[PDB]
């Protein structure tokens, strides 16, 4: 029965899964979808090793729940990143059947419209809204299928409580129409131990799974000595060419038996140093002072916006390298694609590639178990740890951990340990998200439906505060009371409908209504300061510097520095010698300045000399406020602001590419991020409907020209020709003009 | 030779205009058309009476340089209702044979590119930016054709400079490149003296006639004598049924004859009460106390946006009426068609008539020789008496202008007056405005250029001041001296493009951009207080009636009254009881106060009401403000003001129209005004989309509710029936869909 074959599957499906290497399924994944009446809608939450073939089993459903009853599904996942990739391996899957699969995940949205689609492969922050824009306006029976991968994100984390509020809120749908399912549900977890509790809560039905189809061997590195999981000495370790954690040494030993290994850091600088060793010791150790692949690969990275690196150009041409969040995203998809290929062999990451996407290696060398200053997580030592043997070309993979002394004692708890049981998360935030969303959404008025509701969730699986949550939402003119029926106001439907936490949307309001009595339309940094999230931590900010810019900023930004709070006895200058909101003032200017300067196509290169923000991080900060921008959007569109949802309208896409307004129709194309639209628009081009029929020949010429064989990289379709680039460009841009009218 | 088939003309044409019923030329026609080389480029200057057909030798010269030399002309015309009339004239003569015709008037755009464009009926404001633009962008191969209807208004008007600046400006054109034409140049006047001198300005050739079709007798009338022009009586009045003027027994005589007749008063309270006098005396002296036609002209202006007028009610039912600026443009426009079928038989009139739409009628009775306070012009006169007289119906007209005492002695003045020699008008506005349009076109360079321009205007014909202008405009920024050769900057090429003068773009370009500094978003009254072009003389303003209303405005309006400049102090106050700037401010807030009802969709009466404007003022108010909307927009455009021409785009629309954002979609179609696009936005329509498939028997019904045969007005469409009007309405929404992607 292990065949994809004898499974009922399309055939264009099944040839395109033949393409990947899925031919023929495991035990554990036929077990857990004959589970029942699974196949018919009993939800499904099961748990497997990520190297197991996890998903299989929710792609086989989805493709079910869609041929066969054809109706909406989601796909939940942790981040952009995983998203993306999720969303391109299901439309290579799925073009071919004709499942429309586009993508809800950061900023990005799909061009047409969710009615079109027929799969939306969300992030959990963007499918809770699109859940919410479903059961506002009455459309809950499109949806039929909800896919949530990474099912233990529902617990303790900072997007994981919207998981829960995605199906706690789905359930009372479709256990309130009850007065095998209307939308089904499956979830992907890790060996959690109460994953029972979660299957009961969605009525699901449980499948846990060890298999793991390349076995494991984690392992501790003491001094000179390898002990085994149950402290037991497995191997006397002497290294080859050593100039105690020989950790050159190992990945030497790894690397003799052409295969890879992936080095797991606390730190950028730390992978940065411990790739420059290995690089060094690689030319010393190996030339006693594939190739054309590698130099292509060294071409790609240096036709980008940040160019080539310096410490990537010691350390690639010998084949190892690192991958931190300090490069750019452009960056961090060329080494990890070099990494799946084979050209990279030793890869020096943090542990944000752990979570993310999945890049086995055949060795996983863990070099500390304290990991920025705590000890390493349970579920993060298992993610990494997972990694470790490639299917279906390693016989064992292997994972060593390297502690010593009394650090013995964490590498030993973090070997025998085991992961941590899920919470709920939910007066607090997520309650008074849950109780505005059922009733602004009308899907509950009554205290009552109140408390049912609440008896829906995590919290009554597990095993007042509805109570508190009505009447902070009373108190804050989010909602009304009637003969005591509660209705949304205006604000209250704006805030359900924007997805912004209602905590943080009463000071969205303040700001905004503040903005519209006085606005600066000379520049765009009044509009980008109502749009700039927060400061977070997205960067370290240097107060003399800013002060410096804020020295030499036009005759006409200090009007809206001082017009939105800003100052300059406090700007850069006691703090520069040495309030909770004047600091979330200056610091929400200071990140004003930089979306500016991304907004104004300055390099990357030049906005972190000038602000001392590497290029990772400016990244994030301008997606986070592409997403920011959105979301003000629509919060005005629906409060009926039309004279600052217009302004707001274009910021989104001018965030999301870091582009000026003149590309704004170029960057429609998916193959025009920011360089390839500029010089693409100084040759004349400057709309999609020039560039349908811009001359082929022509523009590959322009593409050849202003570098910084398959040189252009291109989010999700790695390395492009410049040729078979800017034919795919033109190709777009015929679609796009031929299907929007 | 006199027969518009022996002449070469299209067969689709003819036909055409043997509906109208020309059929047969006069020999003033074809002398004028065979004056050489006029038919070859030759420009051409003609004058005659404008009921012998003027405008037919015009037309057939465009039929000309439109289908042998195929290139763009231009119709100017002096009003916009004049040139409307003239638009859909030459629309239903030329669709036929493919000539695309497209009017720039007032507000209005052709939809359309100019390129698209074959004929541009363009008012004079609006051809000379016309021509900038084409002068700018290089695409002067294009025109070949310019016809100048009233060409007498090239001298003293508001509006004929800017005709004076139109044609030197093109005459150098063509003059330049000579270092029988390239853009022909054929204008239509009235008897005036210095025709020559025009005609030989032009180097056009000149065609001078007097031949009227129906002879006219102009008389004046003292006491009950009636004098032909020259001082001899020519007939002895005596009344019929009289209750000295006996105007009343003028139009009884004239009626009894089945005629009708123009009475042209000095005032609209004058017109209405003696439109009142006629009403009474015909039904009391003809009732001793078409009809179907007549009552659908009365439910054709009860179904108006005003509704029905008291004195319309009162007069109208008799065949009596008036018609005067007082009026909306629908009401003038139905009280127009009701006299030109015959259904009105006494029509009193003001002045403003005159120069207006051709209106025939069989006597024109003038009742005070003193217009205004002052002595009738004599071209107003002429204007007046020439419309004695219906072409193929009258054997003759009748003009009689009624004066007495010493009035007599104006009455034979104007009767044995001539028209007055034609000006020039050009430091100074025009001459400033000129050099600027010659510099920034880039067409001159040199002062040594810059006096040969002025060497080819109806100054330098007729028989420093360039010098005098290119100071000025070196002192106010708008041009650059390099070495000293003049050359556009910014603020001189957002000048030329925005087509405003370079004395009020000064202060425009000062207003918003302190307006830029601070700007109130949260309503539509500091982007209205932008649009707002002046106080004029739109309405006579009542202090204590602004005054309230401002007591009584929202809790954000003064904001944007203390952000521009108005005060409380002065605000109707002081002058409530009872500076040159405060005094253009606070008419600049009525006036913006009064637009935002106008885009608000208050009922016309209601803002009648509440201000005590009429609905012509409104009427003539909101184009005005829409015109300089698009003047605004197009200025901030070309200035790099991306946040302030986003915020103006949609105010054109909105004040054209006098609608809310919703309808900016819906009267894009030409049958939707404001009244019947809001009665088919409720009804679920909200945009051109759900229109052009909009059940068509559904939009009947709804057309037919809402009531404030052909009851429905269309602008130039005349009177509707509801289900051909809405058959219309669909129609029209499927081409604007269907050509304009
Ligand atoms: C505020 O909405 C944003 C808009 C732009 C970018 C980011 C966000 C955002 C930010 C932070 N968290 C969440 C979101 C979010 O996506 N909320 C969404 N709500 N509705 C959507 O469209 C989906 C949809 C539309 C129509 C139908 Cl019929 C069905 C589904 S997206
Ligand atoms: C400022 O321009 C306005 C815009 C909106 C409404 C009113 C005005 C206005 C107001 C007062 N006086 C004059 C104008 C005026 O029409 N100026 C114009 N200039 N260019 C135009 O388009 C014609 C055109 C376009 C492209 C080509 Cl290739 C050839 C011709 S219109």
Redesign the interface.
């Known amino acids: 029965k292990l065949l994809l074959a004898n499974w009922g599957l399309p055939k264009a499906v099944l040839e395109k899964y033949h393409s990947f290497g899925v031919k023929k399924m495991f035990e554990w994944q036929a077990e857990c979808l004959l589970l029942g009446q699974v196949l018919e809608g009993k939800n499904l939450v099961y748990s497997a090793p990520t190297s197991a073939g996890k998903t299989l089993v929710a792609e086989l459903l989805i493709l079910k729940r869609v041929l066969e009853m054809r109706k909406k599904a989601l796909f939940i996942l942790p981040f952009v990143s995983v998203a993306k990739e999720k969303k391109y391996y299901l439309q290579s899957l799925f073009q071919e059947v004709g499942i429309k699969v586009d993508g809800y995940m950061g900023s990005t949205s799909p061009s047409r419209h969710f009615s079109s689609l027929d799969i939306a492969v969300c992030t959990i922050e963007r499918a809770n809204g699109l859940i919410n824009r479903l059961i506002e306006e009455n459309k809950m029976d499109l949806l039929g299928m909800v896919v949530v991968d990474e099912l233990h994100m529902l617990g303790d984390s900072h997007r994981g409580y919207l998981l829960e509020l995605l199906l706690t809120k789905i359930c009372y749908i479709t256990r309130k129409s009850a007065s095998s399912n209307a939308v089904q549900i499956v979830g992907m977890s890790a060996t959690l131990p109460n994953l029972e509790l979660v299957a009961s809560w969605l009525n699901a039905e449980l499948y846990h799974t060890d298999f793991r189809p390349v076995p494991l061997l984690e392992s501790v590195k003491v001094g000179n000595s390898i002990y085994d999981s149950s402290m037991k000495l497995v191997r006397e370790f002497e290294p080859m060419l050593q100039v105690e954690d020989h950790v050159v040494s190992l990945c030497y030993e790894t690397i003799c038996d052409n295969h890879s290994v992936l080095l797991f850091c606390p730190s950028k600088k730390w992978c940065e140093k411990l790739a420059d060793i290995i690089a060094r010791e690689f030319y010393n150790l190996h030339h006693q002072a594939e190739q054309k692949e590698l130099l292509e690969v060294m071409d790609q990275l240096r036709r980008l916006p940040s160019g080539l690196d310096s410490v990537l150009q010691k350390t690639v041409p010998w084949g190892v390298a690192f991958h931190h969040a300090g490069l750019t995203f452009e960056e961090r998809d060329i080494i990890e694609g070099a990494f799946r290929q084979g050209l990279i062999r030793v890869l020096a990451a943090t542990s944000t590639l752990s979570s993310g996407v999945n890049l086995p290696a055949r060795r996983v060398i863990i070099r500390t178990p304290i990991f920025g200053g705590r000890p390493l997580d349970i579920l993060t030592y298992k993610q990494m740890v997972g990694r470790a043997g490639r299917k279906g070309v390693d016989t064992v993979g292997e994972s060593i951990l390297i502690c010593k002394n009394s650090e013995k004692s964490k590498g030993i708890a973090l070997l025998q340990g085991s992961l941590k049981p899920v919470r709920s998360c939910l007066v607090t935030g997520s309650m008074i998200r849950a109780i505005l969303e059922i009733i602004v959404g009308g899907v509950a008025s009554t205290s009552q439906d109140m408390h049912t509701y609440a008896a829906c969730t995590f919290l009554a699986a597990s095993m007042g505060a509805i109570e508190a949550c009505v009447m902070w939402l009373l108190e804050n003119e989010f909602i009304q009371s009637t003969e005591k029926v509660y209705h949304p106001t205006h604000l209250g439907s704006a805030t359900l409908s924007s997805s912004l936490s209602p905590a943080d949307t009463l000071d969205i309001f303040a700001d905004l209504?503040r903005?519209?009595?006085?606005?600066?339309?000379?520049?765009?940094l009044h509009?980008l300061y109502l749009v700039t999230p927060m400061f977070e931590d997205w960067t370290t900010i240097d107060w003399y510097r800013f002060f410096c810019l804020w020295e030499k900023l036009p005759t006409?930004m200090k009007?809206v520095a001082e017009?939105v709070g800003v100052e300059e006895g406090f700007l850069a200058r006691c703090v520069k010698g040495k309030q909770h909101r004047q600091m979330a003032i200056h610091k929400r200017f200071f990140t004003s300045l930089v979306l500016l300067d991304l907004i104004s196509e300055v390099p990357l290169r030049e906005i972190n000399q000038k602000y001392g923000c590497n290029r990772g991080q400016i990244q994030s900060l301008q997606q986070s406020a592409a997403v920011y921008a959105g979301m003000i959007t629509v919060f005005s569109n629906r409060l009926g602001?039309?004279?600052?949802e217009?302004?707001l309208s274009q910021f989104q896409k001018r965030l999301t590419f870091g582009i000026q307004?003149e590309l704004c129709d170029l960057v429609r194309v998916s193959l025009l991020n920011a360089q390839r639209a500029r010089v693409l628009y100084a040759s004349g081009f400057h709309t999609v409907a020039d560039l349908a029929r811009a001359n082929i020949v022509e523009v590959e010429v322009i593409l050849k020209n202003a570098v910084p064989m398959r040189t252009i990289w291109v989010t999700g379709r790695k390395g492009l020709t410049e040729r078979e680039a800017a034919a795919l460009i033109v190709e777009e841009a015929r679609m796009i003009l031929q299907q929007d009218?």
């Open positions: 209504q903005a519209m009595k006085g606005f600066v339309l000379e520049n765009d509009i006409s009007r017009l602001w039309h004279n600052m217009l302004l307004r009218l």
